[model samples]
Target: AELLVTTRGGRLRGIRLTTPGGPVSAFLGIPFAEPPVGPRRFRPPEPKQPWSGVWDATTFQNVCYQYVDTLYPGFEGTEMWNPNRNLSEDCLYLNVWTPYPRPKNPAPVMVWIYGGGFYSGSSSLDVYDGRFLVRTERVVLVSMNYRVGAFGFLALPGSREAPGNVGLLDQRLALQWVQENIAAFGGDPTSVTLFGESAGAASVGMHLLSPPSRGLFHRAILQSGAPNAPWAYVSREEARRRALQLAKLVGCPPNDTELVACLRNRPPQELVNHEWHVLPQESVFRFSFVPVVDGDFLPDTPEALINNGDFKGLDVLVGVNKDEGSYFLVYGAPGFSKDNESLISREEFLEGVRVGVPQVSDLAAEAIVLHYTDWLHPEDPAKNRDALSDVVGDHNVICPVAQFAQRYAANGARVYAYVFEHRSSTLPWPEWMGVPHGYEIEFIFGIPLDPSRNYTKEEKIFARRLMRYWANFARTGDPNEPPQWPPYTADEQKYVSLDLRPLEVRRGLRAQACAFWNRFLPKLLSAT
Candidate 1:
């Protein structure tokens, strides 16, 4: 049956569904902001208007515009992960799922932001369905969609017309809406947890540093992404260059006014079709259209902010999967075999290093290769493919996250760290890629109970454990009730290693490797 609830934007009719655990109400496709169409394009999001009548929110709206199967093409798990829906530029919607019809006391709220390299993703994906989480955790779950790619983040320097990071502004607006409106759906406004994976995680980290985002969220959980990841932020000059290139492709003049006007006049497909061409082609990690340091939203780089102690003092739980680089590297060698001696050539490896650290000199690049080389296979560097994967993982995901967590710990912010090591047997990727990137999402979301799939008892238990930890963290600052997880500190450097059995508390995960990248390498390169 349809249930009625009043929100700041007006009345909404949501549908109630029966789950294995209990009954829940899902209010899908609730618009939090006005459609960024016509003159609104490339501008900050405005508040959504109140409707006159009850709005039907049972069905999901059109997902944000993005390339789906055409971008991945036969890559493992693409079909299951991609949003199965049509596209739209007017896709500024959020979804909510609550366990109770109406409660005297508000429930703890969790707002999930999805990650797609800040280019392609939607909150409406089947995998992101919040019924399981709302039922199991007994918390109000919310997910929202924001702009991506050129339309979302294109920056034109020296002008307010196309200042970058509008996508982030979209997220901020959604959080504001939740603070003002979530109570009607039985959620605590003050006690909210913001969590995401990959680019979404990066977004959460950005909000932590952004001055405008202060007090919008109480706690944050960043999984497999950090603000300091090389590609997470772009320079203003680079953003301008990419914007001009995109304009030229669409046959628009380089002037800010004309370019934006021409872009608005063009169909959305024209811009999306040429997005891949405009981006840096060196590596999968390098995204052309991403968040940039606009003076308004981001006054300085995330590294500078962290160094200057310009961040909120909020409880944080941050982590990364064991093998984040494997997912990117596998694409380069999809037909890879263990017996193949030359899976990655020396030239290819050098190019990858150059792409990852574009500012480094050739001498510094050679030093990085030596630091990561496996001396046992001295003659054939390609034989050390695992080492290469480790280098990429540490450079892109692990070290940045560890450094961020350490900084937060040093600043006296309550912090918890973890390394997800559980590899599902049913995962479609090759076994060699241990716990490939984003392998933890299904486990975190408690993949809807399937009888035919026959999920093992151990996997189900681990999922429940994860839900408990996440829920506990949201309810309180600490992520422990029964499991006894420890808080992170610079001196102790303790972290939880999550797996199927025997969850171990370890100290200094990837200490030696991260020390080289985060502490030693920059000094070495700068000296040269």
Candidate 2:
């Protein structure tokens, strides 16, 4: 039987769902915005039209059109499409997974943002299913689908009237919806924890600085992504150039506002299937549609803002996987030398890295070599692989994130940092890809045990502790108190280093590289 649930705008007839464990009545595919189609295309999201009758809320919606090739080139599976669902410009929707019955006290809410480099990805990835979290942790989990690729990050100089970060705005609106509607599903709106991996983490980083997102989330967990990563974003001028090129490719002139409108009315998949593929190559240039640094949504560089004490009061947790650059090394970019040897000169490597993250100083590069050169020398042939991972990881991922954490903590906010150290043996050439990026997802979601590599009892213990840390941060602002984590302060720079064997509270985590980074990062970024 269906239950009638009242929402802020109207009502929905949702069905009670039963799974292997028990019964759960779910409200799926609830629209949060007017479809981003027709005249609304490229514009900011508008409130969804209130339905006259009870809308059937049953099965999950299809994820927004994504470049499936972007993940695993040329591999498309049925999982990529949900036939029963509809696709439209008005596709801003969110799913709520909660325990069947309501508890007296509202449960902590966890809002998840999926990551696909800001151009592709949806909240509906199987890795994100919140069944385990909801059933075991006893909390409410919310996953949202936001605009991607051109629809989300396309910016043009003359197109000033359009919202710059429609994707981020979509997220803000989703949180607002949760605040109004989640209590009915047994969730606490005020204790919300916004968490994400990769692009999602980067989005959280932007939200940390967005005025619109200030009070929307109480706490945050950023994994394998950070705001200040070397490949940040460009000014509106550069972004607009990319947008104009996209318009031209789609048979519209840069000045054709009417033509832009016509293009908006075309089928959504056309844009998804065609435009999404070229994004990554372009992103290598200026990151076609990253969280823009437009003065309104994101006032300033997150590092500068936090350094100037913008996020002094927000409780923050930021981290990255041990080998974040492996995926990039394995999939995109030039192939790494089999033995870690640089095919390009050190100077050439530095220049290429600088193109994406100009903030990496020469001194920083030297520091990277000093600290990381030896560790990567596993075999004679793959000698410099560690160097490549170090340079890219520091310039693009690690150092920038550390800068933000250090700056935020320096401002007196309770800040904690982590380095996820679980090395995956399943990665190609297991010995080479140590704790590669995105490996923490299955564990974070508590994916069922894989028999191939039987998980040791210790691994299970680590997983349970990690779940506690995440759920606790979602419930409150502190990840330390609940799981025996040490607080991070400016002087001590104390932070947790998460690994399978033991967790440690360490000082000077990635110390050498970060110190050199602090010297020239700002100047380099400003020059770009």
Candidate 3:
């Protein structure tokens, strides 16, 4: 169950392992860059050593410093916190899962950027195992870990002490590693597809506009997130304020030298726990950590630039889940039932969306409310589910994704959009948080982490089809070929919805919300 493949670099022996469906050989925890510790802490990643011996890469690496409980609280006994995994500033690693260590023909490579709102998550999560994608589709699946939370993104102005978006730089370094080494693992480096969920998807959108990331991946997927989302960024002055507060909390002065020293030596748990409790939503964009739009690494606002033909000729897939707010209510204690009009204050909502769209009126707000009410509880139970699907679907997710797609498509990019509607017969059932955010990961990757929502024969068939569609898209610019589905086109306004019953070319379904958002977009974005 092992193979010795000879490449330009040298002869390396790889081990084959068995996955759920079939067999796969993987090289895990392979270092892509030099450690970013000590003097290199805030700077970008460096190239790793060309080792002499055969590195044992049979096991996956621990994700950059994060608290597993943040994502799945009350769940226990996982390798996410295993002491066996390495932890350090030098942590920039990538893992590869291939049907065979040596393939008869080079296959397209799909590299995943794990999403945890840029603060928490690792590629090593059980839910993300690439076995199904590799074994079934005959494509190479590469999943990587970038620094998260404070370690990855914290911008301090004029200090030269901290470089922002270290997470993005981590991604670039991993791509560089793939370009240099993926061929040895039977992958076509030039045909890389950069796909991710949530923050990871947002990161893919960022890469679309970044000069540094151009040509690293030919195709991209942004699921349940976008760079132009309302919470896209916090201003420079605000970023500085948060940095100073974090430095002070960690016993470091705001100046360059002292800040680096304290940050490097402070206990990792302190940074995670402190920010988990105190960082203000406005100051940190509601997540304890996020990719910073640092002037140097990420020069311009991606949303603004991409809308103006800045990211031309890129094949893109962008989408969101049916219900993005359910988890927010579940974990954050604010459910969709709360009177957003009462809680958010009419002026605040109007003012925010107005920045995103300068011409806003009272009627627009009324429309949003009406839509929300109808969908939350429709007259008929069946109608309620569909309305709920559309309502919770648009306000929380689809609207933002539509706004992004319209802008990019307007700018001349071939954009594909989707809505994940296949709700699992699991815990969020009787209550109905249909297709909650991050729930599609299991279906897309062809694995089920939650035993309660075990895949039925039909679900498995749907999962296989979706996986092929994704793999086909990643391998070639077009996802449809004979047995596969067709690619989304602007003229047709076509999009596919992956659900219990998958459908194609669904358009005009998100018009109302998009129109409302467009009316007040400028005000929302420019608002302080």
Worst 10 residues of 2 by lDDT: 75-84
lDDT of every predicted structure (CA atoms): 0.82, 0.68, 0.66
lDDT of 3 by residue, 1-528 (tens): 355544333445656877656688877777777777767766667777666666667777656776545344333322332323555555677788888545788889999987777777777777787877788888888887898877787766566667678788889888877887788788999899999988888888888878778778889988888776655454566666676777778777654667767776777777766665435532212565566667655676765576566774678877777666544432332222322312333333333332222233555545544554444433443343334345434554566677677777766677767777787653332345556778888788877422344667777777877787787788776666662244455456667778767564577536766675556534644552
C-alpha positional error of residue 513 in candidate 3 after TM-score superposition, expressed in Å: 1.3
Better of 2 and 3 by TM-score: 2
Give lDDT tens digits, candidate 2, residues 229-329.
64556567766666656666666654446556755756666665556343434223234566666888878767667777775267888788887765555
Which is the better candidate, 1 or 3, if ranked by TM-score? 1
Error of 1 at 274 (Å): 1.8
Model 2 earns a TM-score of: 0.85
Which residue segments of model 1 deviate by more than 4 Å? 69-76, 102-104, 333-359, 379-383, 448-454, 524-528
lDDT of 1: 0.82
RMSD of 3: 5.3
Task: Show where candidate 3 strays beyond 4 Å.
Answer: 1-13, 70-72, 75-90, 282-285, 335-396, 426-430, 448-453, 483-492, 502-504, 524-528
RMSD of each: 2.4, 4.3, 5.3
